[PDB]
Amino acid sequence: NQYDNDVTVWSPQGRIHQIEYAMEAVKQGSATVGLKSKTHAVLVALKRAQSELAAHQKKILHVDNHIGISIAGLTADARLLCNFMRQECLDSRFVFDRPLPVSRLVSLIGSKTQIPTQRYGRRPYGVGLLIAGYDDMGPHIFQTCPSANYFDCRAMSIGARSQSARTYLERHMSEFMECNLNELVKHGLRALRETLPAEQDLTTKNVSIGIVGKDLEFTIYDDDDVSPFLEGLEERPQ
Amino acid sequence: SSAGFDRHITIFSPEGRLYQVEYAFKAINQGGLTSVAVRGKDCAVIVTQKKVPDKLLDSSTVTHLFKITENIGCVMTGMTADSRSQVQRARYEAANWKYKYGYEIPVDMLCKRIADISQVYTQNAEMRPLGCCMILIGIDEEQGPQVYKCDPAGYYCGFKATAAGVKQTESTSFLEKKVKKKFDWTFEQTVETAITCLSTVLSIDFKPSEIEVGVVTVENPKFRILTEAEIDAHLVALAE
Amino acid sequence: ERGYSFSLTTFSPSGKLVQIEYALAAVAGGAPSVGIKAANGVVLATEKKQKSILYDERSVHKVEPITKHIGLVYSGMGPDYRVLVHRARKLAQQYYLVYQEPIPTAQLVQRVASVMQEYTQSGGVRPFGVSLLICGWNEGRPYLFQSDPSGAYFAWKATAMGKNYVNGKTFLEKRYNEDLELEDAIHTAILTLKESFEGQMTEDNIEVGICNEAGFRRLTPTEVKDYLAAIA
Amino acid sequence: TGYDLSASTFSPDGRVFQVEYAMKAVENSSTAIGIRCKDGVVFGVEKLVLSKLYEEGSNKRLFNVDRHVGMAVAGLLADARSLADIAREEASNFRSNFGYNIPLKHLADRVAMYVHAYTLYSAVRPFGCSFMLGSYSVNDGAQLYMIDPSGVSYGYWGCAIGKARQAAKTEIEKLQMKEMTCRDIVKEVAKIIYIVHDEVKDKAFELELSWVGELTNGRHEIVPKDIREEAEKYAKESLK
Amino acid sequence: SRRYDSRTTIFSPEGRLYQVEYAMEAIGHAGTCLGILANDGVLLAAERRNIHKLLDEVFFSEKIYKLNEDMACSVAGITSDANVLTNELRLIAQRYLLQYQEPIPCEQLVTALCDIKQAYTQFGGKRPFGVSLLYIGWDKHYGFQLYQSDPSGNYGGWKATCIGNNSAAAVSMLKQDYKEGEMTLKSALALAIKVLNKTMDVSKLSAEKVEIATLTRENGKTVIRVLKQKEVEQLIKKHEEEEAKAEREK
């Protein structure tokens, strides 16, 4: 256990435990779900609150005209990588005068997070990214990790009790590719209503949805343009 | 006598020791490798075996004989990374000598610079002291051929019958029993004594495909790596 | 590197610096040497036994000139010794750049001891296990300066450093005196070195440098075998 | 025990446990082999789908460093991404500074020195990567190298990195490697990867095959494996 | 990297300081020095460490360092550790003179050196200067002076100073035999001879074991007298005649 101190120390079983600890710290964020169609990439998160009176901590935040990211974990490192993200977008927007393809941006993010996991004197980033974007080959749903082993998927779900949501993604990943936005979004919250305990229901104010489409600029919605999305449901089979 | 953190860093111990460097003098011994140098007359001979159990592994790129400059060769033991890094540093300081001073570097000055860099790594802590040993050979005018050895500690020396690696207490015992009869060394004598001393150490008496022979002579001062055919020629020439 | 920059050498509850005392012990576990200041010259002499019969005595040289008139020997570890030799060389040549005159030995010992003192205090590096014996014939009067790893220095009429240096010192006090010549100093220096060395002592076991007023001189094994072939 | 913490220290018997721990980190990673024919080098990586959540074509471990060079990594993936960026940068420097293609020997030596520099100090950890380097040039032929986590880089004809390090190269060495062009070697690598671990520990894997050589005219890319579909119709004939 | 840090500056588990107290105890096992009350003139006393017979003594100063033209200093502790401070100190005085072309008024000199010492007390985390050292000198604003630096950086202007375990009893003799008004250098030399006669364990006080230097004002000059041996010898004979005078009470 005395080798279980710092980022630099390898294990005598090879598994550097700081990255495992950062993973488990990412697991204790809010739940979130990101999934794409052939033409529309929708990411759906869930908010929590500190108390009754306070507002909810926001998760789905804007990045650029075709990029919006979800998040889980710490918010300071989140806003730090958000600053870097916006910077890297606007830099190529300045130089090449084109929007960035998503994959090279996520390569830049992984290379950015490579250094603080590699030397001594920095920590890995508690971070929960779900990136949705549009290059010329359409929507992409990427996720990252504090180990920077970023993945491309067709539907991920990270955060608290996200595994049952992944079972839902398994049993409807055939269905996902074909449909339009409405039932896509209600599949998304038909994952999130299983991210919750069954003795309560998903209300308006706690949920947030971000859509980007191949002609649609990335737009965030909260309770007012989500009241149309919350109807069209039945109860859970109690 | 482990006082303070003398098992960990470059500090002085009680009674006068420091363990990090005298742990590095057996950092050569994990190589499983053996090297012999000979200088008796106006030629100078290196010999060192390989150990390749694989058919999938090559044979050309496995050689430890490293042409530093056109007149200076060397051979390495110990672990490979430290050896090759030391090799690039040696080449770099040789080219720097040629640029600054206008003429070819002598093997003496170069080994002294390598030992100085070894001290520089030795001096600060938080720095790993490069567990490889370097033997250099070359011809100098008005002195003939030269043999030098470089320690990890930065203690270089230059001497005739030379051997470092795994088994060289025995090799130096053979060379004390051998370099005492006052015979001359007419270059077949040198090659024959080198191969036979490595043959008395390892007791294998093997093919010409295992040892690499590095030679340099005052007839052609260029460094020269021997070919399979002439190694076989010398081998069957000492086969009686 | 990172530049961690802290020194490992801090004070004891006794007030001592145990790394420096260990470095002095590591010096004392080194090769013997003898240096004697006579009435006209100074004699340096070391004791160099090769580990095998394979080593050559033409490559490594203990006795070392710093200028053409300043000899310098040690008792310790050559890898540190060469470093501070080279430092002293560059330092003396900077002096000769500024003043266009040969640097005096006191000035050498000031500057070298300041550098060594700086290594005793600066960050993380070990001190240098070398005890110098610096000398030279500057302005008629010759000098003899011993230094140490602690950065300090002294001035001896005659001294010794290395194995059984106290025994050599006690022989020096009875045998050596204030006024002799360079030859008699060489004689008693070889006597006190041969008091403590091994039995097989030849023209290659020792290495002797003298300091005339004509300058520093490094003797050859030719004249050593002229002299040390049963000097008494 | 106690010595194994820092990456600058030695052991009481003489090795660095940090580098050893980094070496056996790659042991649990996926199996990645590579073999050269007489006019090209063929890569191959046993890649595994986790359960159902991948896309068959993300995070490809077959990288592509230079116009004629690509990597075949195994171990930690993000560390491999960083290492490949270093190699891309180095080949870019050489192309800029000399105006032609980097030779594979010099490239691998620069990479090996970079790896060694990350093995020296205590400020950084050693890498958890083990990768392949393939080449083809008309004046050079086919060259295949191999880099451990420590930094020892030399040449092969065939190799394997992963669990079945021995278990693949047992029957790699019975392949008639010289007399075959790479178009046979494609289905050879296919049968090698398919033989090791069909269903025992896991449920499903997936094949990628990189492909450099004379048939590509010195280009390096993945095969259109779906063109000529050489695994499966030979895979089902390889279970008997 | 962070399990190799020493304490290096930090306060105790109980409220006190570590390196400062250990620096004081490093001072305590050194040579003995003192200075006297003289209205005209001021003096220093010093004890020879390493009085072995095979030295050269050609430096004319083993503890004294004539630092300005009107100031020297004794010293006690680690030697070249102090030689660094002598170099820097002479440098600071000389750049003062470069800036003004008027000699240094010696208290801001002392504060400059004390700030050098204090800068390694708080941050910098290196081995602190375990050297206390005296000050003699003269000026335009107070005349003859005496000062006592400490590794803390605290400095005291005394009229009769203090070194450690060898000299705590010396300060006891200084208080029990305090003088005032008599600026006579020779009575002060007899006093200092008496003080080192008690405190040093050198039996009957051979002059090879001691060292005295003074600083008198001569007509525009403030010369620094590192006096020779014969007058010390007759001073010792004077003091032992005074011992005979003391045992006239038997």
Next chain:
Amino acid sequence: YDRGVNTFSPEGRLFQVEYAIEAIKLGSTAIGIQTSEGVCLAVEKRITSPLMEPSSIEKIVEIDAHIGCAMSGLIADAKTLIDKARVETQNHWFTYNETMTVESVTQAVSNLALQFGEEDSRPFGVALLFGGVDEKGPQLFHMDPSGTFVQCDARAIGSASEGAQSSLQEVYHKSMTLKEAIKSSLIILKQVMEEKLNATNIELATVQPGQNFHMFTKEELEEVIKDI
């Protein structure tokens, strides 16, 4: 030294940030309430000596002409934060001829709430209540040492904040008025403090869209106190 500055947990979050959230608790309490009429704000000075002059102790400081503040726990770290936030609002005015709004203020603060770093120093030990009036009316903002900044309707900080938040949730609703909220706040103040409530204990700070200047009440506070 017991897993310090730069280490996660086997189960959860960082050590020293959790220790900062613990270190907030010893501070003196404060209560802000957002009303659409304007933001009111209160604090307790915790004065010990009669020598301790009351009006020199600052808790509510003034960031801009329409932005208040409140602090907790430590003092001078909060003073440095106040200084830099003032500088950044003035820079925003300098390059924009307008008012840096309250959220942008708090983002400019929380961008280095966690930039604690000793290599390549310690995290700050103060929780802050921010009140201001943007173009969207009044705002009430609550931040923390960990940078996790949120909007609160009526936040209570520091010591005894559990019962403070509870009994504050008892009386609050959306359509409160100003003076009602003020007296309801000082009720909770004199329920959580230990001394008698008088002219020197607490201080009020009220900002209105029409009363942008003078976010303070001075000795009319005595009249406000005597009405309970």
Next chain:
Amino acid sequence: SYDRAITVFSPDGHLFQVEYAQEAVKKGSTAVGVRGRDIVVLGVEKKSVAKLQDERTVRKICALDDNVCMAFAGLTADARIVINRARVECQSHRLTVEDPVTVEYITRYIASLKQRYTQSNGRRPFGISALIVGFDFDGTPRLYQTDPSGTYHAWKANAIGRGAKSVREFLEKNYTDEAIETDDLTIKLVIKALLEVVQSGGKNIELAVMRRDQSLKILNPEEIEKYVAEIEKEKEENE
């Protein structure tokens, strides 16, 4: 620099160095100070000289400008650094805006310096606590104190050093607005507070004042003797 923090938080939310290094100030020389309506009075105790030596250099009360006055506790060296720094600072304020320096500005400087000195990378915080007395704005008498954390804190009277609880408890009876507010009685009753020290030798008293328009004046132990005599006279009159 040294990448190591001295100021890590506790498990329960404290600092192991700041509130801990206040104990060095607690183990120091005592010094009190009040502000009257026109004359300010302060002074240190515990001269503790060897009764044969000098004390004109061991002076613990100094000035930065002609209008402000100093004091400290703890160890003297950190106080020396802070004093020279603050002299440079107030004279550089004179280089700026041409007012005499307000006391609040210079105390903000001192406390801010000490704070950002505690915040930085591996630096031992100043174990002092100063007392900063001055009357600048129309001669309004003020005194501020510091803290090793760096929290300036305005008072009307003050007690630091050894046994300051006992001194403030003498001040408890000595808080009267009357106190009959002459300059001499204010000075002598501050002298009675400093003579409520744990030893009270009477001659170890070092007191100096300022009349809010003049400069610093050091007293003489014969007027202090008259003050001690009239204090004993009032103690006889109460009987």
Next chain:
Amino acid sequence: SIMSYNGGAVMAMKGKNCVAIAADRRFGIQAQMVTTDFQKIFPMGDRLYIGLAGLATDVQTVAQRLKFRLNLYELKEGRQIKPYTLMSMVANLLYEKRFGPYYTEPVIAGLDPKTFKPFICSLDLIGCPMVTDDFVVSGTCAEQMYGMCESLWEPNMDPDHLFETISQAMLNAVDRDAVSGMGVIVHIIEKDKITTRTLKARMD
């Protein structure tokens, strides 16, 4: 010239066993004098002076800088300085401003510290030393003092005729000069003592 911005003339002259250095007293701006007691001859230890001429800024500056380095050396070593060492030091100090040059022509005159050997030398504004045995001159007027010294110098001279020779040379060569005059100071030194005489120069 810029050397003729403030006038100035320094003459040194080697006698038999003694050395005489003299300079002019005048200081002022281009056409306007100011004072008659400006210092250009500085004592550098015992039996060894230095003279500086040219721009008075560099005169006082380099005088202070050399005094700085000289006192540093004389405290690092208990002996006093030898004149060749002083010459090398001045050469280094001028050469450090190879492209930022002081506008001065230093003249060094001192005896031997051990014997009664005299020494004279002069430098350039960049540090080119020059040792002679008869005389070295500097300042604005050159050819005047060259002609006079090549007219009046003898090799083996008692201090009296040395004094009279250097006096007549300086007086006539200054009276012919325009921007440099207004009194002359003379330092005539030897092993035994130091004489400083002032001449009744033409104040025109």
